PDB file of all heavy atoms in Angstrom:
ATOM      1  N   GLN D 133     158.306 174.010 270.426  1.00  0.00           N
ATOM      2  CA  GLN D 133     159.351 174.340 269.438  1.00  0.00           C
ATOM      3  C   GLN D 133     158.723 174.511 268.036  1.00  0.00           C
ATOM      4  O   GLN D 133     159.301 175.193 267.233  1.00  0.00           O
ATOM      5  CB  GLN D 133     160.351 173.208 269.373  1.00  0.00           C
ATOM      6  CG  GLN D 133     161.498 173.291 268.546  1.00  0.00           C
ATOM      7  CD  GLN D 133     162.299 174.615 268.742  1.00  0.00           C
ATOM      8  OE1 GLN D 133     162.199 175.496 267.948  1.00  0.00           O
ATOM      9  NE2 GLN D 133     163.017 174.599 269.824  1.00  0.00           N
ATOM     10  N   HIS D 142     155.932 179.408 255.283  1.00  0.00           N
ATOM     11  CA  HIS D 142     157.136 179.133 254.557  1.00  0.00           C
ATOM     12  C   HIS D 142     156.812 179.145 253.020  1.00  0.00           C
ATOM     13  O   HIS D 142     155.691 178.986 252.617  1.00  0.00           O
ATOM     14  CB  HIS D 142     157.602 177.765 254.925  1.00  0.00           C
ATOM     15  CG  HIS D 142     159.093 177.563 254.840  1.00  0.00           C
ATOM     16  ND1 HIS D 142     159.694 177.155 253.685  1.00  0.00           N
ATOM     17  CD2 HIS D 142     159.996 177.642 255.722  1.00  0.00           C
ATOM     18  CE1 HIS D 142     160.945 177.075 253.840  1.00  0.00           C
ATOM     19  NE2 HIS D 142     161.200 177.368 255.087  1.00  0.00           N
ATOM     20  N   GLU D 143     157.933 179.324 252.287  1.00  0.00           N
ATOM     21  CA  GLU D 143     157.713 179.592 250.779  1.00  0.00           C
ATOM     22  C   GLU D 143     157.367 178.137 250.267  1.00  0.00           C
ATOM     23  O   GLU D 143     156.692 178.022 249.156  1.00  0.00           O
ATOM     24  CB  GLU D 143     158.901 180.045 250.056  1.00  0.00           C
ATOM     25  CG  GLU D 143     160.224 179.436 250.377  1.00  0.00           C
ATOM     26  CD  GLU D 143     161.335 179.898 249.418  1.00  0.00           C
ATOM     27  OE1 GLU D 143     161.076 180.863 248.725  1.00  0.00           O
ATOM     28  OE2 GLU D 143     162.324 179.227 249.347  1.00  0.00           O
ATOM     29  N   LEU D 170     142.638 159.430 245.440  1.00  0.00           N
ATOM     30  CA  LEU D 170     143.334 160.658 245.605  1.00  0.00           C
ATOM     31  C   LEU D 170     144.686 160.444 246.189  1.00  0.00           C
ATOM     32  O   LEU D 170     144.894 159.473 246.900  1.00  0.00           O
ATOM     33  CB  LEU D 170     142.451 161.558 246.488  1.00  0.00           C
ATOM     34  CG  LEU D 170     141.119 162.020 246.037  1.00  0.00           C
ATOM     35  CD1 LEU D 170     140.387 162.624 247.179  1.00  0.00           C
ATOM     36  CD2 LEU D 170     141.148 162.917 244.811  1.00  0.00           C
ATOM     37  N   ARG D 172     147.468 161.297 249.044  1.00  0.00           N
ATOM     38  CA  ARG D 172     147.274 161.137 250.442  1.00  0.00           C
ATOM     39  C   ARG D 172     148.019 162.252 251.178  1.00  0.00           C
ATOM     40  O   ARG D 172     148.976 162.851 250.628  1.00  0.00           O
ATOM     41  CB  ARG D 172     147.708 159.841 251.022  1.00  0.00           C
ATOM     42  CG  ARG D 172     146.944 158.578 250.522  1.00  0.00           C
ATOM     43  CD  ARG D 172     145.448 158.591 250.776  1.00  0.00           C
ATOM     44  NE  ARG D 172     144.818 157.382 250.348  1.00  0.00           N
ATOM     45  CZ  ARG D 172     145.073 156.130 250.748  1.00  0.00           C
ATOM     46  NH1 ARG D 172     145.927 155.924 251.733  1.00  0.00           N
ATOM     47  NH2 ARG D 172     144.514 155.081 250.206  1.00  0.00           N
ATOM     48  N   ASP D 177     150.894 164.914 259.584  1.00  0.00           N
ATOM     49  CA  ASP D 177     151.660 165.789 258.761  1.00  0.00           C
ATOM     50  C   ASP D 177     151.646 167.224 259.436  1.00  0.00           C
ATOM     51  O   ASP D 177     150.696 167.502 260.113  1.00  0.00           O
ATOM     52  CB  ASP D 177     151.132 165.845 257.376  1.00  0.00           C
ATOM     53  CG  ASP D 177     151.785 166.891 256.476  1.00  0.00           C
ATOM     54  OD1 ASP D 177     152.898 166.615 256.083  1.00  0.00           O
ATOM     55  OD2 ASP D 177     151.224 167.993 256.250  1.00  0.00           O
ATOM     56  N   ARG D 207     144.425 166.175 248.516  1.00  0.00           N
ATOM     57  CA  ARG D 207     145.062 165.095 249.385  1.00  0.00           C
ATOM     58  C   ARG D 207     144.011 164.611 250.386  1.00  0.00           C
ATOM     59  O   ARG D 207     143.457 165.406 251.120  1.00  0.00           O
ATOM     60  CB  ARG D 207     146.332 165.607 249.997  1.00  0.00           C
ATOM     61  CG  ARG D 207     147.513 165.641 248.989  1.00  0.00           C
ATOM     62  CD  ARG D 207     148.758 165.961 249.623  1.00  0.00           C
ATOM     63  NE  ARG D 207     149.869 166.093 248.714  1.00  0.00           N
ATOM     64  CZ  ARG D 207     150.615 165.172 248.246  1.00  0.00           C
ATOM     65  NH1 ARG D 207     150.405 163.883 248.614  1.00  0.00           N
ATOM     66  NH2 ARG D 207     151.567 165.400 247.341  1.00  0.00           N
TER      67      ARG D 207
ATOM     68  N   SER F1348     163.203 179.010 264.111  1.00  0.00           N
ATOM     69  CA  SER F1348     162.703 179.688 265.288  1.00  0.00           C
ATOM     70  C   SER F1348     163.753 180.462 266.012  1.00  0.00           C
ATOM     71  O   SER F1348     163.976 180.333 267.218  1.00  0.00           O
ATOM     72  CB  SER F1348     162.053 178.723 266.206  1.00  0.00           C
ATOM     73  OG  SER F1348     162.947 177.866 266.720  1.00  0.00           O
ATOM     74  N   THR F1357     164.161 180.538 254.643  1.00  0.00           N
ATOM     75  CA  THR F1357     165.125 179.568 255.165  1.00  0.00           C
ATOM     76  C   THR F1357     164.727 178.194 254.866  1.00  0.00           C
ATOM     77  O   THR F1357     163.544 177.731 255.209  1.00  0.00           O
ATOM     78  CB  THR F1357     165.276 179.812 256.693  1.00  0.00           C
ATOM     79  OG1 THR F1357     165.787 181.091 256.981  1.00  0.00           O
ATOM     80  CG2 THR F1357     166.239 178.716 257.265  1.00  0.00           C
ATOM     81  N   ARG F1380     162.917 171.178 243.638  1.00  0.00           N
ATOM     82  CA  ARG F1380     164.001 172.177 243.592  1.00  0.00           C
ATOM     83  C   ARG F1380     165.353 171.419 243.658  1.00  0.00           C
ATOM     84  O   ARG F1380     166.242 171.846 242.811  1.00  0.00           O
ATOM     85  CB  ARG F1380     163.727 173.049 244.792  1.00  0.00           C
ATOM     86  CG  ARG F1380     162.758 174.145 244.627  1.00  0.00           C
ATOM     87  CD  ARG F1380     163.098 175.322 245.474  1.00  0.00           C
ATOM     88  NE  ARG F1380     161.922 176.210 245.671  1.00  0.00           N
ATOM     89  CZ  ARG F1380     161.759 176.996 246.708  1.00  0.00           C
ATOM     90  NH1 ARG F1380     162.594 177.081 247.718  1.00  0.00           N
ATOM     91  NH2 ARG F1380     160.681 177.858 246.719  1.00  0.00           N
ATOM     92  N   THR F1406     155.709 161.417 246.298  1.00  0.00           N
ATOM     93  CA  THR F1406     155.041 162.022 247.388  1.00  0.00           C
ATOM     94  C   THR F1406     153.559 161.884 247.321  1.00  0.00           C
ATOM     95  O   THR F1406     152.813 162.427 248.186  1.00  0.00           O
ATOM     96  CB  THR F1406     155.260 163.597 247.415  1.00  0.00           C
ATOM     97  OG1 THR F1406     154.768 164.137 246.195  1.00  0.00           O
ATOM     98  CG2 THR F1406     156.775 163.830 247.475  1.00  0.00           C
ATOM     99  N   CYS F1407     152.898 161.116 246.417  1.00  0.00           N
ATOM    100  CA  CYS F1407     151.499 161.078 246.248  1.00  0.00           C
ATOM    101  C   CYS F1407     150.755 160.284 247.357  1.00  0.00           C
ATOM    102  O   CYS F1407     149.529 160.448 247.516  1.00  0.00           O
ATOM    103  CB  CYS F1407     151.126 160.459 244.870  1.00  0.00           C
ATOM    104  SG  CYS F1407     151.868 158.817 244.506  1.00  0.00           S
ATOM    105  N   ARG F1408     151.523 159.441 248.117  1.00  0.00           N
ATOM    106  CA  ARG F1408     150.937 158.613 249.101  1.00  0.00           C
ATOM    107  C   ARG F1408     151.177 159.203 250.536  1.00  0.00           C
ATOM    108  O   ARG F1408     150.955 158.457 251.499  1.00  0.00           O
ATOM    109  CB  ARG F1408     151.501 157.237 249.114  1.00  0.00           C
ATOM    110  CG  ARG F1408     151.131 156.377 247.785  1.00  0.00           C
ATOM    111  CD  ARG F1408     149.604 156.171 247.821  1.00  0.00           C
ATOM    112  NE  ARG F1408     148.965 157.001 246.901  1.00  0.00           N
ATOM    113  CZ  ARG F1408     147.579 157.128 246.842  1.00  0.00           C
ATOM    114  NH1 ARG F1408     146.774 156.393 247.674  1.00  0.00           N
ATOM    115  NH2 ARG F1408     147.011 157.870 245.971  1.00  0.00           N
TER     116      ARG F1408
END
Side-chain angles (χ1 to χ4, degrees):
Chain D
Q133 182 56 253
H142 210 276
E143 52 167 14
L170 297 170
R172 295 301 182 61
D177 173 75
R207 282 183 186 275
Chain F
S1348 66
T1357 297
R1380 283 209 198 151
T1406 63
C1407 55
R1408 291 294 104 192

